[PDB]
Protein backbone atom coordinates (compact mmCIF):
# COMPACT_ATOMS: atom_id res chain seq x y z
CA UNK A 1 0.00 0.00 0.00
CA UNK A 2 2.58 2.55 1.14
CA UNK A 3 5.67 1.69 -0.90
CA UNK A 4 7.47 -1.63 -0.60
CA UNK A 5 8.61 -4.62 -2.62
CA UNK A 6 7.06 -6.60 -5.47
CA UNK A 7 9.00 -9.87 -5.64
CA UNK A 8 12.64 -9.15 -6.49
CA UNK A 9 14.33 -10.01 -3.19
CA UNK A 10 18.00 -9.95 -4.18
CA UNK A 11 18.27 -12.14 -7.27
CA UNK A 12 14.87 -13.38 -8.43
CA UNK A 13 13.05 -11.45 -11.16
CA UNK A 14 11.17 -13.75 -13.54
CA UNK A 15 8.56 -16.33 -12.55
CA UNK A 16 8.51 -20.03 -13.42
CA UNK A 17 9.48 -20.62 -17.04
CA UNK A 18 6.32 -22.05 -18.69
CA UNK A 19 6.87 -25.02 -21.06
CA UNK A 20 5.25 -25.55 -24.44
CA UNK A 21 1.69 -26.71 -24.94
CA UNK A 22 3.31 -29.64 -26.76
CA UNK A 23 4.05 -31.28 -23.44
CA UNK A 24 0.96 -29.83 -21.75
CA UNK A 25 -1.38 -31.23 -24.40
CA UNK A 26 0.30 -34.63 -24.08
CA UNK A 27 -0.11 -34.71 -20.30
CA UNK A 28 -3.74 -33.64 -20.37
CA UNK A 29 -4.27 -36.25 -23.08
CA UNK A 30 -3.47 -38.95 -20.53
CA UNK A 31 -6.11 -37.65 -18.13
CA UNK A 32 -8.99 -37.48 -20.59
CA UNK A 33 -7.83 -41.02 -21.38
CA UNK A 34 -7.49 -42.11 -17.77
CA UNK A 35 -11.01 -41.06 -16.79
CA UNK A 36 -12.36 -42.76 -19.93
CA UNK A 37 -15.31 -44.96 -18.86
CA UNK A 38 -13.87 -48.05 -20.55
CA UNK A 39 -10.55 -46.98 -19.06
CA UNK A 40 -11.95 -46.59 -15.56
CA UNK A 41 -12.43 -50.29 -15.29
CA UNK A 42 -8.73 -50.28 -16.15
CA UNK A 43 -7.77 -47.10 -14.29
CA UNK A 44 -8.04 -47.94 -10.62
CA UNK A 45 -4.52 -46.49 -10.23
CA UNK A 46 -5.75 -42.91 -10.55
CA UNK A 47 -9.12 -43.21 -8.79
CA UNK A 48 -9.02 -46.43 -6.75
CA UNK A 49 -5.48 -45.55 -5.61
CA UNK A 50 -5.71 -41.90 -4.54
CA UNK A 51 -8.79 -42.70 -2.44
CA UNK A 52 -12.26 -44.25 -2.35
CA UNK A 53 -14.91 -41.97 -0.86
CA UNK A 54 -17.46 -40.82 -3.44
CA UNK A 55 -16.26 -37.64 -5.15
CA UNK A 56 -13.16 -39.41 -6.45
CA UNK A 57 -10.31 -36.93 -6.01
CA UNK A 58 -6.98 -37.54 -7.75
CA UNK A 59 -3.75 -35.95 -6.51
CA UNK A 60 -1.68 -34.51 -9.36
CA UNK A 61 1.45 -35.35 -7.36
CA UNK A 62 0.61 -38.98 -8.09
CA UNK A 63 0.04 -38.50 -11.82
CA UNK A 64 3.63 -37.27 -12.00
CA UNK A 65 4.93 -40.53 -10.58
CA UNK A 66 2.53 -42.47 -12.79
CA UNK A 67 4.46 -44.99 -14.92
CA UNK A 68 2.23 -43.89 -17.82
CA UNK A 69 2.69 -40.17 -17.25
CA UNK A 70 6.26 -40.24 -15.95
CA UNK A 71 7.18 -41.81 -19.28
CA UNK A 72 6.90 -38.25 -20.61
CA UNK A 73 9.66 -36.26 -18.91
CA UNK A 74 11.43 -35.80 -15.58
CA UNK A 75 9.83 -32.35 -15.44
CA UNK A 76 7.19 -33.55 -12.99
CA UNK A 77 6.86 -29.93 -11.89
CA UNK A 78 5.75 -28.37 -15.18
CA UNK A 79 3.70 -31.52 -15.45
CA UNK A 80 1.53 -30.02 -12.71
CA UNK A 81 1.20 -26.48 -14.07
CA UNK A 82 0.59 -28.07 -17.45
CA UNK A 83 -2.60 -29.59 -16.07
CA UNK A 84 -3.34 -26.24 -14.49
CA UNK A 85 -4.14 -25.26 -18.09
CA UNK A 86 -6.48 -28.25 -18.42
CA UNK A 87 -10.02 -27.19 -17.69
CA UNK A 88 -11.56 -30.23 -19.38
CA UNK A 89 -11.36 -32.19 -16.14
CA UNK A 90 -12.01 -31.02 -12.59
CA UNK A 91 -8.72 -30.19 -10.88
CA UNK A 92 -8.25 -29.39 -7.19
CA UNK A 93 -8.15 -25.62 -6.51
CA UNK A 94 -4.41 -25.20 -6.84
CA UNK A 95 -4.94 -27.39 -9.86
CA UNK A 96 -3.04 -29.78 -7.72
CA UNK A 97 -5.70 -32.44 -8.16
CA UNK A 98 -7.97 -33.99 -10.74
CA UNK A 99 -11.37 -35.20 -9.65
CA UNK A 100 -14.46 -36.08 -11.69
CA UNK A 101 -17.92 -34.50 -11.65
CA UNK A 102 -19.78 -37.19 -13.61
CA UNK A 103 -18.00 -40.59 -13.70
CA UNK A 104 -19.54 -43.54 -15.52
CA UNK A 105 -19.73 -47.13 -14.17
CA UNK A 106 -16.68 -49.24 -14.94
CA UNK A 107 -17.42 -52.43 -13.05
CA UNK A 108 -20.92 -53.06 -11.65
CA UNK A 109 -19.87 -56.41 -10.19
CA UNK A 110 -16.42 -55.41 -9.01
CA UNK A 111 -17.78 -52.39 -7.16
CA UNK A 112 -20.80 -52.37 -4.85
CA UNK A 113 -21.08 -49.06 -2.91
CA UNK A 114 -23.43 -48.90 0.07
Curated annotation (Swiss-Prot):
Annotated HTH La-type RNA-binding domain residues: 17-108
Superkingdom of origin organism: Eukaryota
Tissue expr: Expressed in numerous tissues.
Subcellular location(s) of the protein: Cytoplasm; Nucleus
Free-text function comment from the UniProt entry: Regulates the coordinated translation of type I collagen alpha-1 and alpha-2 mRNAs, CO1A1 and CO1A2. Stabilizes mRNAs through high-affinity binding of a stem-loop structure in their 5' UTR. This regulation requires VIM and MYH10 filaments, and the helicase DHX9.
Assembly with partners or alone: Interacts (via the HTH domain) with VIM/vimentin. Interacts (via C-terminus) with non-muscle myosin MYH10. Interacts (via C-terminus) with DHX9.
Record note on domains: The RRM domain mediates the association with collagen mRNAs stem-loops.
Name of the protein described by the UniProt record: La-related protein 6
Organism annotation: Homo sapiens (Human)
Residues of the full protein shown: 70 to 183 of 491
Amino acid sequence: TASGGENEREDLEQEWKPPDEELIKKLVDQIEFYFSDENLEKDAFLLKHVRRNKLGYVSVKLLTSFKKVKHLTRDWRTTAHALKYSVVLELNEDHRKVRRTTPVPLFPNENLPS
